[PDB]
Amino acid sequence: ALLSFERKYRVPGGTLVGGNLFDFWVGPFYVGFFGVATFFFAALGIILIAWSAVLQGTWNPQLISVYPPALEYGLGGAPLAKGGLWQIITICATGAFVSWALREVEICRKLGIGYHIPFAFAFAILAYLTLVLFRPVMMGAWGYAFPYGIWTHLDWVSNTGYTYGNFHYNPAHMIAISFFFTNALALALHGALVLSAANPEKGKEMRTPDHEDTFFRDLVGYSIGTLGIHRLGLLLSLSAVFFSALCMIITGTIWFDQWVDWWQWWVKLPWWANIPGGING
């Protein structure tokens, strides 16, 4: 079925691979060669997960967990039951995410729009690949990756953090958090702002973008503007993920001691290192 305004946009073209072979929809979904790739990788993935479930001996989704090979395997392959399936499922996962991004590119091309969405998405994928691929390769073993399980992956977050003390003290991690919290602040403000203008007090006319600038200037002395704010949200959220990837790519590789102790470089600068008093003298 189609949206009321949709038909005029469902023209041939835009595909990256296959000409018109896969230029069609199933219901609302565009297919394309990357739709077929996505389905294949996802489908194989889910089947391997399900099989892993069988070898774990559970079907509870709060218990199913697929763990990477143990550290002893290094960066080699492992038997299916003992890490192999994780390695295959990771390849399927990566294949599905990239296929999804590339399908998104095909959709942009057909729609005549910019490529900003899949570009943004590629940041998420790179964050994923940092945890399951790049970091483990630099650390020399797949077993440093997180396992695929609803709760078991949370165990991995917590064990990995406490390996370096309170992980709060990772400076890239502080920046990352700042971007996340700022992004959510920006999202609340923007949603509230547009809605406040579209849904004014009872009986009154819709406000204008000019009212939106006025509100913010009245409140904080500045307005970023309607282009600005969409640029901002995109920057805040992509920066949050970039710094997340960064904060983990350095952990266990260039820095692997307790993160609190990193801050001693500042405290020990020579001009104040030995001045008495304060917390550190």
């Binding site: 942009c108 949603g191 509230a192 809605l195 640029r231």
Partner: protein, 302 residues
């Protein structure tokens, strides 16, 4: 390359925009500030005017006194020495009264009293600022969504600083004013409550925080993707749907099988954001009042 519209290629400037008037008392607006060509590559170049009536003066004064109180304590901890003050900046901490004082105000200045003074000033600064968000909306005839959203953030802060300490019977449960000390507090809070990953409200709060990054990356990217058709003019796309709004919906319909409208995406937005701190504050408020140990609780409740 296609130009991607993250930064502007050419800036134009006109006379300072003094804003809409509606019901605003114009005696309380400043003149305009300077223009910043630097900001203008990315957003608007104009700074000001700002509106400062009595509630604004109150809020700022109070906010500054919150900051002066903390900073006074920091310089004292630094032995009045500027080198030490910069060196140890993130280590200084203004700490609330000991458990022994409960909720009283009887503690000495160097050992709790200053913390209460600082919190007192923060409380006034934030709530008067909350009042500003309502009142500036009202003067412009606008909806109150911002004030309602800000309230969700106020909720977490109130729970951490005021409600939960009161319910627990002492100020020793509130958060210290310090960069590192507050991070230590957060970590300790989890440990002592049996690990916040087992608090379903903490999990939800994460879903929403990540979700806000997902959603604003989606939305920001989408609007910029359709900026070649005037997409960022959202109010007028609401009032008169254009090919911007239609391409945006259909991107998502074709990708994931459903889509939003230009108005509606803002409702997904406000709520994704606001539920971060709503669920968050519930999670914290329950901790140690009703649940001492989330691991334990999780064993008895799914």
């Amino acid at each position: 390359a296609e130009y991607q519209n993250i930064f502007s290629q050419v800036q134009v400037r006109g006379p300072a925009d003094l804003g809409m008037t509606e019901d605003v008392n114009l005696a309380n607006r400043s003149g305009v500030g300077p223009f910043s060509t630097l900001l203008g590559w990315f957003g608007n170049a104009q700074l000001g005017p700002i509106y400062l009536g009595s509630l604004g003066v109150l809020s700022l004064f109070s906010g500054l006194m919150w900051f002066f109180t903390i900073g006074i304590w920091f310089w004292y901890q630094a032995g009045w020495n500027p080198a030490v003050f910069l060196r140890d900046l993130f280590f200084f901490s203004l700490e609330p009264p000991a458990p022994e004082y409960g909720l009283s105000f009887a503690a000495p200045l160097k050992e709790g009293g200053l913390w209460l003074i600082a919190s007192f000033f923060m409380f006034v600064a934030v709530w008067s600022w909350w009042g500003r968000t309502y009142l500036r909306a009202q003067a412009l005839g606008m909806g109150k969504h911002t004030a309602w959203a800000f309230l969700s953030a106020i909720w977490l802060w109130m729970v951490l600083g005021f409600i939960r300490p009161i319910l627990m019977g002492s100020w020793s449960e509130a958060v210290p004013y310090g960069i590192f000390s507050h991070l230590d507090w957060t970590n300790n809070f989890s440990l002592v409550h049996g690990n916040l990953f087992y608090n379903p409200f903490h999990g939800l709060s994460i879903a929403f925080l990540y979700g806000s990054a997902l959603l604003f990356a989606m939305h920001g990217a989408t609007i910029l993707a359709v900026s070649r058709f005037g997409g960022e003019r959202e109010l007028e796309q609401i009032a008169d749907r254009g090919t911007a709004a239609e391409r945006a919906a259909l991107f998502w319909r074709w990708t994931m099988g459903f889509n939003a409208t230009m108005e509606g995406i803002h409702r997904w937005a406000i709520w994704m954001a606001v539920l971060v701190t709503l669920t968050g504050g519930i999670g914290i408020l329950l901790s140690g009042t009703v649940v001492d140990n989330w691991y334990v609780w999780g064993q008895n409740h799914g």
